[PDB]
């Protein structure tokens, strides 16, 4: 009768540009309106890179992770219909339905669940210790994944189709969902339109694969790899640009050759490059062009030449994409279920948690697309 | 037609006088229409011209905001008469290039701005009387002139019955403000609008945010001056920069929108620090920025953090404003006085006195110059 603590192991940081040390950790039981959560997969991003230089802000010790799907272990009250067995991702934020910007349809950046930073549940408290030691550890996002159970608040946990198979699920909870996202609801690819993706990572082959189901004409993926030119092929990409085979010439008239002078009509910078926005911009069609900044960069401040504020273009600023976790994410959920979009080709490679120092040199790999964490039951 | 020999402004370094000078004005060519300037306007653009901005061309004739009368016609010129009253575009609008078919912007890609000082021929129409050095002239027709020679598709056939001091003001300033209001953001009706810099182009902004119907419209200024011909306008809100040092303006701006932000904000200034600030003062998720005036600098800073707020940066040239198909629907709503333009005029000086004009420009309480011609 009645749940209590949970003792495992975790992914631990504990200074900025750190190692990543596995720890023995204990996690509380879930109270009020808070879920556990048994982790069936997780995954890397550049964003658990940031996590662990500091960026954007500063929090040790922290369980890194984000992307990755579980089982309800555990429930509080009100825990809003969730009970255990059921398999769940989490959230990067809520969608309550009935705030001002919920009921306008025109953006997912709900006021009653916005993103999280404070890496502590909302009483200020962590539910994670040190099972040593005893100093309690932030968690990331709104639920760290690089543990083998983790609590969260029950509005920032979707639950999904038992069928989809959890490797997919992880995929769909950040990268690919928001790159698919993000060509119809920050801009709308018509059919017949002209976009180029920078860099072809998992964000660029969901716009790659979002840009052709809405009827792309010209879809240019531009980036550094040779390697990952060939997984844009399959997802629907029309052209490839190299910027290393033209040194001479930059990516914006790079683009500006394969669409007539005129540029694409949405560019969407997924790398977070600083250099590379202002490209985005100029490779953007002058006048009805616009750009969607989906990648995350590690400093501060992010420059635009000046003279392109005359050139009428549209810069929209986005966070997952665009897409509304209540409302959207189940929508694309289920293409993986008829298979419209098939997530087999972005899984490269397979580690399990006790080797996650292993996976920050991994991603470095030319040939490295996606990174899988399993957890052995043992 | 002959060559008549009248007066200009005339620079003749970088940063350096405005002087009068007797110059030359040559006939207009195929695809050319000259004009006798009724009367003229500047504004910060004219400043930078003089200091060699964009590009330091010298001698030039300063002035882009002004209204005259077509004297003499050269054919091939899209059928326009002497008598026809003009106002110098600063672009032009093609209609059936790519572009003007979307019908979603102003930026037409036959008839874009010119920055060469020069007509098509590469030459100019204008030199001095007595050295005959020819004089590069200002973005697509020089104004500070009695007689001016322009690109027939860089000027636009106006309704004669406006007032000539209010068709130069509405050639550059007031309808970027106005046309931003719904070519670049559609204000829409019980929404909240937020205006950085109440000079002229927030006046024109203010006045087209109320026109459409916004509820609150809060200006953002440190001149009382300003925040009075705000008000004129529609204004409903004010928020004195300096009143407040321990709180920034979007912080402000939060505390008069139930701490959520305006819908559509316009940067009017061009300082970097307020760039950063209009965004920060918009809506999540739902709000739009549209940066109207320029710094003059490399770039322009943001931070990293704003890109997940969801916001909508929209740039702008001209406002948004069509100059074919727009800019003849502003005209007639000040021609049927729905727009009240008396209020901008503040100062009037002649040709002859133009070099007070940039020490008048200064002045607090000044909002528009009318420079005036003789016969
Ligand atoms: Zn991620
Ligand atoms: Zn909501
Ligand atoms: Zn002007
Ligand atoms: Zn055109």
């Known amino acids: 009768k009645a749940p209590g603590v949970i003792t495992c192991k975790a992914a631990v940081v ?7 040390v596995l720890e023995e950790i204990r996690v509380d039981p879930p109270k009020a309106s808070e879920v556990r959560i048994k982790m069936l997969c997780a995954s890397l991003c550049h964003t658990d890179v940031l996590c662990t230089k500091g960026f954007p802000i500063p929090l040790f010790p922290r369980i890194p992770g984000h992307e990755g799907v579980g089982v309800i272990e555990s429930i509080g009250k009100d825990a809003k219909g969730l009970k255990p067995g059921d398999i769940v991702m989490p959230l990067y934020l809520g969608e309550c339905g009935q705030c001002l910007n919920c009921k ?11 993103p999280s930073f404070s890496g502590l549940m909302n009483d200020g408290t962590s539910r994670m210790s040190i099972a040593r030691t005893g100093e309690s550890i932030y968690h990331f996002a709104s639920c760290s994944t690089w543990t083998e159970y983790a609590v969260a608040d029950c509005n920032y946990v979707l639950k999904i189709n038992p069928k989809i198979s959890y490797p997919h699920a992880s995929f769909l909870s950040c990268g690919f969902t928001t790159g698919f996202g993000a060509t119809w609801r920050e801009t709308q690819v018509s059919k017949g339109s002209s976009v180029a993706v920078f860099g072809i990572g998992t964000v660029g082959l969901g716009v790659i694969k979002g840009a052709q189901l809405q009827g792309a ?7 550094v790899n040779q390697y ?17 085979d033209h040194p001479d010439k930059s990516v914006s008239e790079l683009v500006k050759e394969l669409t007539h002078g005129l540029g694409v009509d949405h560019c969407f ?30 400093e501060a401040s992010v420059a635009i030449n000046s003279l392109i504020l005359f050139s009428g273009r549209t810069l929209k600023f986005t ?4 897409v509304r976790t209540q409302s959207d994410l189940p929508v694309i959920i289920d293409k993986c279920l008829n298979k419209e979009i098939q997530l087999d080709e972005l899984l490269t490679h397979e580690i399990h948690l006790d080797n996650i120092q292993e996976a920050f040199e991994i991603l470095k790999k030319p040939d490295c697309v996606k990174i899988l964490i399993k957890f052995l039951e043992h």
């Open 14 to 20: 504990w200074e900025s540009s750190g190692p990543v």
């Open 104 to 114: 306008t349809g025109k953006t997912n950046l709900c006021h009653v669940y916005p």
């Open 217 to 223: 004409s010209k879809i240019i993926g531009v980036d």
């Open 228 to 244: 990952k030119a060939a997984k844009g092929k399959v997802f629907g990409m029309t052209d490839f640009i190299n910027p290393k």
């Open 269 to 298: 910078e997924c790398t977070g490059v600083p250099s590379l926005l202002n490209e985005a911009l100029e490779a953007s069609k002058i006048g009805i062009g616009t750009v969607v900044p989906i990648g995350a960069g590690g």
């Open 319 to 322: 966070a997952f994409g665009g």
